[model samples]
Target: ATFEIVNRCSYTVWAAASKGDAALDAGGRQLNSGESWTINVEPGTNGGKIWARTDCYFDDSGSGICKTGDCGGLLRCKRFGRPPTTLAEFSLNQYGKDYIDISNIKGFNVPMDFSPTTRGCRGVRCAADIVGQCPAKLKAPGGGCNDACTVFQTSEYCCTTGKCGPTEYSRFFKRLCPDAFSYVLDKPTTVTCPGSSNYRVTFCPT
Candidate 1:
């Protein structure tokens, strides 16, 4: 049930973040064996400050909380912004807890330029990373153009960066803040996709 970090580092890592000064700590989860402990996010043009912080922690005493880490570093913790608007086709369930009728597949606008990370990258650089990049149907209904490509090219060059365009960050927020704003699944529980289901997290850019 635990996902391992590919690499380990002595520093800290912030989990999910939002444009409205919100964050969620991983809660003391060890860094991946080979992966970096940090996850960076870039807010598109609709949200506010890309809220961010380190993951949660579990100490020797078996206490679980957003505690301080080495050198005054503390576990990540913060509230998410308001939930997103829902499509009338499907019944609304805070955080996608209930049934998510496929018919309710109306697109959601980025209430604001939302981002998920505030480490390694920050400000416009971070904001640039996740320009307008949403799923096929999730495109910004009344929005403008998507700039993910330009952001990625300027940030890391398409060679090393996995996606020359943006996608992951939006999805990441979708999963982390599903309760705050995501499509609720209402049908049979058995039909519910695994945590890995792409449906669990998706977004669009105007």
Candidate 2:
């Protein structure tokens, strides 16, 4: 499997991806406005996550910090991006289908769209105006909105137990991004397609 990463935003973004040891684009790369990069995945690759790091400040040795989507303070991520980020997650060739989603379950910083390039599947997106309308209680110190779980961290907000469902806070996110994973209990967020299909994952798509 493979996917193209495109930056359709007005500013630069550092893109990162991880699949445990089967790393593709192991070194994070900067994508200027309108620039793009493609990543190829092995057939046996089961799952991975991709995200864009915004407002980054890096040094000559590639050590840096990002306002959003920082991966362990490293230029090349060896693990998943931090919370309060827009995530594009996927499982390729698993259970006879390709599972994918644009998730805000950790919270959203940037807008995202994941669509099949080969047709025969429906696309999923979470391109709503989130930052401008972030709730005061869930606002981040830098920018972006924090998920209820990240903000409250209580069992009620985190859904760590049984009979979990949406709250007023989760409903706020769901109202904006009906297609996204708004919270831990937000089901039906994933989209599936034939395992053989490739995808075009665009960040801040215009």
Candidate 3:
């Protein structure tokens, strides 16, 4: 499915995406409140991520800083956006269906809603203000909350060693957005849609 990025927040949002080594042509576009942009992703495009950068200050040449979702301080993000950001992840045309989700396991900076424009699919959303109530130890410096794995970095939190499951910290995000990925093995958070369906991603959906 193609992706349409929408900004419904009160301020500007620098939207970004990546397909692989090359950044999605939509790269860095300023979406003023209520504005929208569409990225026509071809079928078979796999392992992609989309996110929004806030409070960015870029020079004429498109270089500067963002309060959140900064991708190595570049307007054109050649890599994945840094953490403390809201994320919409996808792997399209895999095993005949499109896998998608709104993930907060990396912590959340903005509220997000992901839905299919056409029918035959279910929508998933994570519209929570985790920043306002972020726990002290897992709090990010700028805003948003860090995942337990990010803060603790142990096998229990990171789930890198043995069989891992949810922790109290993961439950916090799950309580707020049940459909979002709160931990590494958060399987229920994912949704699937038929291939070639068009999708809409809205920021600040509330």
Candidate 4:
């Protein structure tokens, strides 16, 4: 089981650690609207809390109130974790297949944009955008946390096919606009992971 905390306070940093002492020494940070941070929290050993605001704040059980400022707000406690693991290895590359038949899209494409960055669903769908709310937790519906975080988080909407993989989307675009296959970007793309996979192969529709 995984631990989840709902941070409702404004300008507060929320975090959890594995050991009791670690939780005590650690603290939360601040971010703008609709932003979230996740850390590993021990189930029973570590004492997690929310610290910031005007006063010293704490939440050992992962539940408490969150406020606009230092006062914090209501606290909530939850047990979040992977509902399941990947059933089997899947791929974006067709190799020789004409199409991909994939399943189990729980909603990995749930928009993380300004429109719905704080949607924290449980078992299904729920609104999560506050300290007193759980973090956006759920498998990519394809059975993982955006194994393709960049793609799904940027999708226009959840997949209707219950499947999500860069290959399908990239291939579609490549088929349509082979030459102009690049995504519209505001500026030049910076290379993060080089040669890990050929950019052309990794983002095949390029």
* Residue-pair clashes per candidate: 36, 0, 0, 30
1-206 in candidate 1: lDDT tens per residue?
A: 11122222233332233223443224323433223333323212122122222233645653443221111233332333111221111111224322222111122222222221212211111111111544443333233212222233344322244333324433333433332222222222112222211111112211
TM-score of 3: 0.94
| Total backbone collisions, model 1 | 36
Off by more than 4 A, model 3: none
1-206 per-residue lDDT for model 3 (tens digits): 56889999998999988764658765768899999998877687787888888889999988999988888888878788777777888888888888888988777888999898988888888887788888788888877787888777889878897579989999999998899989888766778888767789899999
Q: What is the lDDT of candidate 3?
A: 0.84
**Candidate 1, position 87, lDDT:** 17
**TM-score, cand. 1:** 0.20
**Tens-place lDDT digits, model 4, residues 1-206:** 12222333343332222121333222343333234444333222222222222222446653353321122232221321121111001111233211111111211111111111122211111122211221234322332222222335544323334453445433332233232211222121121221111111010001
| lDDT value, residue 152 of candidate 2 | 85
Q: After superposition, how far is residue 21 of candidate 3 from its true place, in Å?
A: 3.0
TM-score of each: 0.20, 0.93, 0.94, 0.20
Better of 2 and 4 by lDDT: 2
Per-candidate Cα lDDT values, in order, are: 0.26, 0.83, 0.84, 0.24
**Candidate 4 deviation (Cα RMSD):** 17.0
Worst 10 residues of 3 by lDDT: 19-28
